[PDB]
């Protein structure tokens, strides 16, 4: 009671909506989800408290492995023991494992402390200093991301020996407290009246209604008659559809569109015909309509929360039978689908050709006929077969479901295709999730953004995907972190606020301690929004140095100092944002005046000096998606042994036009480097030299050659990344360069088209200052070609991922026309020889554009 009230109030604070609002709906579906999902999440919390210390480290601190390790050299390492000021620096090998490194630190300590130790290397874990990152398991040292980062950046790994007891004590501190088929009658409804309708009185009103199974129409759309435009239009008419009640699939949805004709749309609303308990809906239903910007089947099946302002459409769902009618159970379906129906040698080859991607009408009749041959010989062709199935014929669906339920578990790639709205069947969705269960946390984390979007196409609150995502978030603290932030950022959207809000409440019941951690993070973002508003005002009246000192005063207050300090980074929970360095903080000159908040850690040293950018006024969803795609490219390339020294820095929308960006330290823009400022080391005689002179100055003597190599490699990666992804609006200010030579792009507002790019100032670097250096240039051309063909081998993965992101609601990613850019860029409808010929020609075409500068 005393703690139940507090947990509830903290959840309300955290999710940005009171739990009383949930109960105010007096909604069975909402109530049944809450009860069932609190129970499922409490079971998770209990499982966690009975984990072993290593399994608990796998929960709180999942391993950060190098892409090539997933599925020799000398190394200087610094080790200390938790509580001790003293440390040991020793030589290890990249091929050595943490148990060898621990056994070694236990020897040094045993000789310094003069006694043979009882403790064994198996009782310890290696914490990365001042980070929520550990090194454990039987993986050689080079396979860990931290060790790799260190090896490249020339820094010494600083590790701490954590005893199992310390980890177990840590666990306890973080513990939770204690029949349809007989009805041949056509589908009919009554369009009674409209309410709160606003439109031109010169025009007339009409209602268009259509029956959908996803996108595919179940029958012809039906329109009402033309009534006069007013606030309350009264139709009181019948709309009969050319489909029998028996043929209604489980996931059938009635779609409405209210518009004004002489063509202007007013509003849209849809609903499921069967409720969450599989009962066919009857009685009077009020559809609180959403504004239209003519049917929208993809749109949500829940009403517009703004009941006061919104237009309403009152409909009557007629009583079909004297008793309640439920959708048949799987047992009745697999019974009807069991009984069905030889094939010819030539039609067996015609099939092998069209299963190896739209088809003609006669081929559908062939893929349907050979459905058992599809299951047995081409199991990966499920999706094409599912698209030739008539979801308007109840026996054809029964036949399909009989095969799906015997169908083997598909690879992840195929299962991702099945999450598309094009496959709205629930037994199809459950099958897809069943085939995704084999995703590792690293694969899961990679596609997590796309899976949160898929949640928006869901017709009900209680689903296998919510159960899947919830179970995985509670079993891995990093997944839980990012599932929380993807949902939390979309709370300002009334169409997803209910589902996302209820999901986040469930997670919180399963993770009280993590709710407290995320509360600390929201508390910091609250102060930043308030510091940003002050900065936005102050800067329009006073000068930038003055506004900066005023920002520093405002930050120095008790509430600001406590909120902004000692939190886990929402960009990386492994990164602890410790001590805010007030003197180093500032903001950009742009419209939104984004804040640059700088942090330091006494515990983490060099690695604790981090920077975050708080942005308010701009939508950061497309930046995040692009950066995630660049990250995917990098993983894909590293898996094929290619490290193109990419910088896919963190970017996280946190709320309404609000987000954080990861500051890449020790980097500058080409614009600032090119400014060729006097009384600087880099001062060039010719602007073509500025970039190379800046590189020379940050990398003395022997180091310059490696910086030129870091530049070339990262240049090859971004040339391909921006080409494949259609990144435009490229200027010297949104192309950055790191002190180590790595080139990277920022600010991804325009992608998917909205020609390949090459600059002679980059070519000068690649060529080591030499005017003619085709040895070095062509090495770069080959880096592009190898990178491009690795991406094409995975072209389907980019397509399936981008397809799922149509649910996100991005204006530059909403229809098929957008994904055509990727189809063209990855030239997937061609052979590798025909695509590589096209890459070479586009690289040569981008070169002839560059040569105009030279």
Ligand X SMILES: COc1ncc(C2=CCOCC2)cc1NS(=O)(=O)c1cn(Cc2ccccc2)c(C)n1
C-beta closer to ligand X: residue 424 or 653: 653
Task: Give 793's contacts (C-beta < 8 A, 6+ positions apart).
Answer: none
Binding mask 200-219 for ligand X (x = CB under 6 A): --------------------
Residue 424: CB minimum distance to ligand X, A: 35
Which range of residues in 70-78, 251-259, 304-312, 662-670 is near ligand X by CB under 6 A? 662-670
Task: In whole angstroms, give the CA distance from residue 181 to residue 682.
Answer: 80
Token pair, residue 687, equals 């602007």
Task: In whole angstroms, give the CA distance from residue 807 to residue 815.
Answer: 10
Which range of residues in 454-462, 546-554, 656-664, 695-703 is near ligand X by CB under 6 A? 656-664
- 611, with CB counted inside 10 A (0-12, 13-18, 19+), is middle
Q: Which of 350, 669, 789, 850 binds ligand X (CB under 6 A)?
A: 669
Pick from 89, 95, 174, 101: nearest CA to 134:
101
C-beta closer to ligand X: residue 80 or 615: 615
- Residue 661 main-chain phi, psi, to 5 deg: -130, 145
Which range of residues in 96-104, 148-156, 568-576, 587-595 is near ligand X by CB under 6 A? 587-595
Provide the 8-state DSSP code for 203: S
Residue 568: CB minimum distance to ligand X, A: 20
Contact call for residue 68 and ligand X (CB under 6 A): no
Residue 714: CB minimum distance to ligand X, A: 14
Token pair, residue 693, equals 């002179």
Segment 792-821, which members bind ligand X (CB under 6 A)? Answer: none
DSSP string across 432-485: HHHHHTT--HHHHHHHHHHHHHHTTT-SSSS-HHHHHHHHHHTT-HHHHHHHHH
Breaks (C-N over 2.5 A) in the chain follow: 71, 178, 262, 293, 341, 356, 754
Is residue 271 within 8 A of residue 254, CB to CB? The reply is yes
Contact call for residue 739 and ligand X (CB under 6 A): no
C-beta closer to ligand X: residue 233 or 594: 594
Task: In whole angstroms, give the CA distance from residue 594 to residue 587.
Answer: 5
Q: Given the structure tokens 């910088």, which residue do they identify? A: 647
Binding mask 605-644 for ligand X (x = CB under 6 A): --------x---------x---------------------
Contact call for residue 572 and ligand X (CB under 6 A): no
Residue 537: CB minimum distance to ligand X, A: 18
Contact call for residue 648 and ligand X (CB under 6 A): no
Q: Which of 82, 729, 733, 834 binds ligand X (CB under 6 A)?
A: 733
Residue 613: CB minimum distance to ligand X, A: 5
Task: Give 659's contacts (C-beta < 8 A, 6+ positions apart).
Answer: 489, 614, 615, 618, 620, 624, 651, 652, 653
Which range of residues in 30-38, 339-347, 421-429, 658-666 is near ligand X by CB under 6 A? 658-666
Q: Which of 269, 273, 374, 661 binds ligand X (CB under 6 A)?
A: 661
DSSP string across 662-699: E--SSEEEHHHHHT--SSSTT--SSHHHHHHHHHHHHS
Q: Which of 747, 785, 824, 849 binds ligand X (CB under 6 A)?
A: 747
C-beta closer to ligand X: residue 155 or 588: 588
Q: Which strands sit side by side in the sheet containing 186-195, from one edge to the other?
A: 234-244, 186-195, 312-317, 283-288
C-beta closer to ligand X: residue 238 or 677: 677
Number of residues interacting with ligand X: please give it, by CB under 6 A.
14
| Range list of H helices, 309-436 | 330-336, 345-354, 361-369, 371-377, 382-388, 394-404, 412-417, 426-436
- Coil vs helix vs strand at 253: strand
Contact call for residue 156 and ligand X (CB under 6 A): no
Residue 698: CB minimum distance to ligand X, A: 15
Which range of residues in 327-335, 337-345, 348-356, 586-594 is near ligand X by CB under 6 A? 586-594
| Range list of H helices, 489-557 | 497-510, 512-538, 544-555
Q: Which of 124, 649, 821, 839 binds ligand X (CB under 6 A)?
A: 649
Q: Which of 238, 588, 769, 778 binds ligand X (CB under 6 A)?
A: 588
Q: Which of 664, 680, 828, 846 binds ligand X (CB under 6 A)?
A: 664
Is residue 599 within 8 A of residue 609, CB to CB? The reply is yes
Binding mask 375-404 for ligand X (x = CB under 6 A): ------------------------------
Q: Which of 51, 336, 746, 757 binds ligand X (CB under 6 A)?
A: 746
Q: Which of 244, 430, 683, 734 binds ligand X (CB under 6 A)?
A: 734
Residue 648: CB minimum distance to ligand X, A: 11
Contact call for residue 663 and ligand X (CB under 6 A): yes
Q: Which residues pair with 267 in a beta bridge?
A: 258, 291
Provide the binding-site residues for ligand X, judged by CB under 6 A: 588, 590, 594, 613, 623, 649, 661, 663-664, 669, 733-734, 746-747
């Amino acid at each position: 009671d005393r703690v139940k009230k507090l947990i509830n109030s903290q959840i309300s604070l955290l999710i940005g909506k009171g739990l009383h609002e949930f109960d105010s709906l007096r909604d069975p579906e909402v109530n049944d989800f809450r009860t069932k999902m609190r129970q499922f999440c409490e079971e998770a919390a209990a499982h966690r408290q009975q984990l072993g210390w290593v399994e608990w480290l796998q929960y709180s601190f999942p391993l950060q492995l190098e892409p090539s390790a997933r599925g020799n050299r000398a190394l200087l390492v610094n080790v200390k023991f938790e509580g001790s000021e003293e440390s040991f620096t020793f030589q290890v090998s990249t091929k050595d494992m943490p148990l060898a490194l621990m056994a070694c630190a236990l020897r040094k300590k045993a000789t310094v402390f003069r006694q043979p130790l009882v403790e064994q290397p198996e009782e310890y874990a290696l914490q990365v200093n001042g980070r929520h990152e550990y090194l454990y398991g039987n993986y050689p040292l080079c396979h860990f991301q931290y060790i790799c980062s260190c090896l490249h950046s020339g820094l010494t790994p600083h590790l701490t020996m954590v005893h199992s007891s310390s980890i177990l004590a840590m666990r306890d501190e973080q513990s939770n407290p204690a029949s349809l088929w007989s009805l041949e009658q056509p589908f009919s409804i009554e369009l009674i009246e409209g309410r709160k309708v606003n439109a031109d009185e010169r025009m007339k009103l009409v209602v268009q209604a259509g029956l959908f199974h996803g996108n595919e129409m179940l029958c012809k759309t039906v329109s009402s008659s033309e009534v006069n435009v007013c606030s309350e239009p009264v139709w009181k008419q019948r709309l009969e559809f050319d489909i029998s009640v028996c043929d209604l699939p489980r996931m059938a949805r009635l779609c409405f569109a209210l518009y004004a004709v002489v063509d202007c749309p007013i509003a849209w609303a849809n609903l499921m015909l069967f409720d969450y308990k599989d009962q066919l809906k009857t009685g009077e239903r009020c559809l609180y309509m959403w504004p239209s910007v003519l049917l929208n089947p993809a749109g949500t099946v829940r009403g517009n929360p703004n009941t006061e302002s919104a237009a309403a459409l009152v409909i009557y769902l007629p009583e079909v039978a004297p008793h309640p009618v439920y959708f048949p159970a799987l047992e009745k379906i697999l019974e009807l689908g069991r009984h069905g129906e030889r094939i010819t040698e030539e039609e067996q080859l015609q099939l092998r050709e069209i299963l190896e991607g739209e088809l003609y009408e006669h081929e559908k009749d062939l893929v349907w006929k050979m459905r058992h041959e599809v299951q047995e010989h081409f199991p990966e062709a499920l999706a094409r077969l599912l698209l030739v199935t008539k979801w308007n014929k109840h026996e054809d669906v029964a036949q399909m479901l009989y095969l799906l339920c015997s169908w083997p578990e598909l690879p992840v790639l195929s299962a991702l295709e099945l999450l598309d709205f094009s496959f709205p069947d629930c037994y199809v969705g459950s099958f897809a999730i069943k085939s995704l269960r084999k995703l590792t946390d690293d694969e899961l984390f990679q596609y997590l953004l796309q899976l949160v979007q898929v949640l928006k196409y869901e017709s009900y609150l209680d689903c296998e995907l919510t159960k899947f995502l919830l179970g995985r978030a509670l079993a891995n603290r990093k997944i839980g972190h990012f599932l929380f932030w993807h949902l939390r950022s979309e709370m300002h959207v009334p169409s997803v606020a209910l589902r996302f809000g209820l999901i986040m409440e469930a997670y919180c019941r399963g993770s009280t301690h993590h709710m407290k951690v995320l509360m600390k993070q929201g508390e910091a973002l609250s102060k930043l929004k308030a510091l940003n508003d002050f900065v936005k005002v102050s800067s329009q009246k006073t000068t930038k140095p003055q506004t900066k000192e005023m920002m520093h005063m405002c930050m120095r207050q008790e509430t600001y100092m406590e909120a902004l300090s000692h939190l886990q980074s929402p960009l990386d929970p492994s990164t602890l944002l410790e001590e805010v360095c007030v003197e180093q903080c500032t903001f950009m000159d742009s419209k939104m005046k984004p804040l640059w908040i700088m942090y330091s850690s006494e515990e983490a040293g060099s690695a604790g000096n981090v920077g975050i950018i708080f942005k308010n006024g701009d939508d950061l969803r497309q930046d995040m998606l692009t950066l995630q795609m660049i990250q995917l490219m990098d993983v894909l390339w590293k898996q094929e042994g290619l490290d193109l020294r990419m910088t896919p820095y963190g970017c996280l929308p946190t709320g309404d036009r609000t987000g954080l960006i990861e500051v890449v330290l020790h980097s500058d823009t080409i614009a600032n480097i090119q400014l060729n400022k006097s009384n600087m080391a880099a001062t060039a005689a010719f602007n073509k030299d500025a970039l190379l002179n800046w590189l020379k100055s940050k990398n003395p003597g022997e180091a310059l050659d490696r910086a030129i190599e870091e530049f070339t490699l990262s240049c090859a990666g971004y040339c391909v990344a921006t080409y494949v992804l259609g990144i435009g609006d490229r200027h010297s200010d949104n192309i950055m360069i790191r002190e180590s030579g790595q080139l990277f792009h920022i600010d991804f507002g325009h992608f998917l088209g909205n020609p390949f790019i090459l600059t002679y100032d980059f070519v000068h670097v690649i060529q080591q200052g030499k005017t003619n250096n085709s040895e070095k240039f062509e090495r770069f051309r080959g880096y592009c070609e190898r990178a491009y063909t690795i991406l094409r081998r995975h072209g389907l993965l980019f397509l399936h991922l981008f397809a799922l992101m149509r649910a996100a609601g991005l204006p530059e990613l909403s229809c098929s026309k957008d994904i055509q850019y990727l189809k063209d860029s990855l030239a997937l409808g061609k052979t590798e020889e025909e695509a590589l010929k096209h890459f070479r020609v586009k690289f040569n075409e981008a070169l002839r554009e560059s040569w105009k500068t030279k």
